[PDB]
Amino acid sequence: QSALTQPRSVSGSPGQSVTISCTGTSNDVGYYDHVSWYQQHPGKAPKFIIYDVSKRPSGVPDRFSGSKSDNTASLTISGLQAEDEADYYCCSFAGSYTYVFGTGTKVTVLGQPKANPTVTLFPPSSEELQANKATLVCLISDFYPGAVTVAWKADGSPVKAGVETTKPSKQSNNKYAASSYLSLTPEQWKSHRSYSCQVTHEGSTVEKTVAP
Amino acid sequence: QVQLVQSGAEVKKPGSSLKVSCKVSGGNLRSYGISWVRQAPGQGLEWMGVIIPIFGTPTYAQKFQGRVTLAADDSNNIVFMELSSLRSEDTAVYYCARDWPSITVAVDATNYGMDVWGQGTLVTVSSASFKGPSVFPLAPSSKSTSGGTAALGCLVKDYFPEPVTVSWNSGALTSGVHTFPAVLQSSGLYSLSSVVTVPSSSLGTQTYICNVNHKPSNTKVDKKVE
């Protein structure tokens, strides 16, 4: 079956309330009252937090609450704390010993002011050029929230092929960092006079430029 | 205090068969049911099947019907999941979870709820061969220098499989260090970066060496960044 429909992301300040929607069909969410929710922190296993639409297992704080309406279940976190920043998945019994999981929702707790990103662009190293390879490495650091878009340009024209970008990861100082690579060959790297890595964060763009 | 202990990580080629085990401690498996949920890297949870040993033959999700099997060893409190004809899209972390999709009494558990989860089993499916990485220095420049500080790093390129560990000055340098997660390229090999922001006063005096360890290939590389 198709996965239950959840919002991609959701955010709120400490002390605020947030709601995750979970839309299924009349054969699962709208049929049974067996909707469960699960919290997953980065690099860890999911955690049982909600079952039977609105029942909380032993130990889960009453900050979390559940509800259902037609084919849409909802999870509410009332009084966001830094620990609540995680991924959340809904799940519903689908009949005949089967379950269906939701697409998952990222909960962001905006407990830190906006930080503008620092962009560092490295040209292909002389060591890699001898290996008949040329990789441009764009490093973005110290930005909050952790959401950026990276675009590459060569002499002003956009470059999308050969681009690989990591999702933002938390630094040691709780800010976020991201990396993007433009993998070429020395011949293709020498065929353009200037390369640009543009990073858009919260509506503002930052650009770094290198030249062969 | 029931706990689920899963088998270790595994690297397998396309066309082979996977076998992961889930061992129950602190309770009897005959009173429980076990679900299996997998999660591709950076993706969501996906239910695959469930087995209740006291109720007989298990049930599988439709997209896995024909290449997944579930079996239980009641005397050893362990269940097994076998996924056959592995493809690259089967690369995921495979969890087991105590479950009871039943109206009957869930002994020490919860009806229609996955309450106890295992630590997960990382499974990589790829045609690539074991290969150590090539390390390249990301030298500091005038474009990486601003306000008495400068950024330098190392490019760890083309290795398989995960993971690699990066340190700076044998682990003595940790302030300002950030090692990025790896990217999976079209070549089937991984690549990541590790950068460190460093005062510009020390660039001419202090030595900065990144230490890269790829234990699957027993490759250790030290690269001075000048």
Author numbering:
A (entry chain B): 1 to 212
B (entry chain A): 1 to 226
Text of the article:
IsdB is part of the S. aureus iron-regulated surface determinant (Isd) system, which plays an important role in the acquisition of iron from the human host. IsdB removes heme from hemoglobin and transports it to downstream Isd proteins, where heme is transported into the cell and degraded so that iron is released for use in fundamental cellular processes. IsdB binds hemoglobin and heme using widely conserved NEAr iron transport (NEAT) domains. One class of IGHV1-69-encoded mAbs blocks S. aureus heme acquisition by binding to the heme-binding site of NEAT2, while two additional classes reduce the bacterial burden in vivo by an alternative Fc receptor-mediated mechanism.
Efforts to crystallize NEAT2 in complex with STAU-399 or STAU-229 were unsuccessful. For STAU-399, we found that labeling of the NEAT2 peptides QVKSAITEF (residues 324 to 332) and MVEGQRVR (residues 396 to 403) reduced deuterium incorporation in the presence of Fab. The interaction with antigenic site 2 (defined by STAU-399 binding) showed that the long CDR-H3 of STAU-399 plays a key role in the recognition of this site, interacting near α-helix 3 of NEAT2. The canonical F54 residue on CDR-H2 of STAU-399 still interacts with IsdB but is removed from the heme-binding site. STAU-281 reduced growth when added to the medium, while an inhibitory effect was not detected for the STAU-399- or STAU-229-treated groups, in which the OD values did not differ from those of the group treated with heme alone. While STAU-399 did not block binding of hemoglobin or heme in vitro, it significantly reduced the burden in the kidneys, liver, and heart.
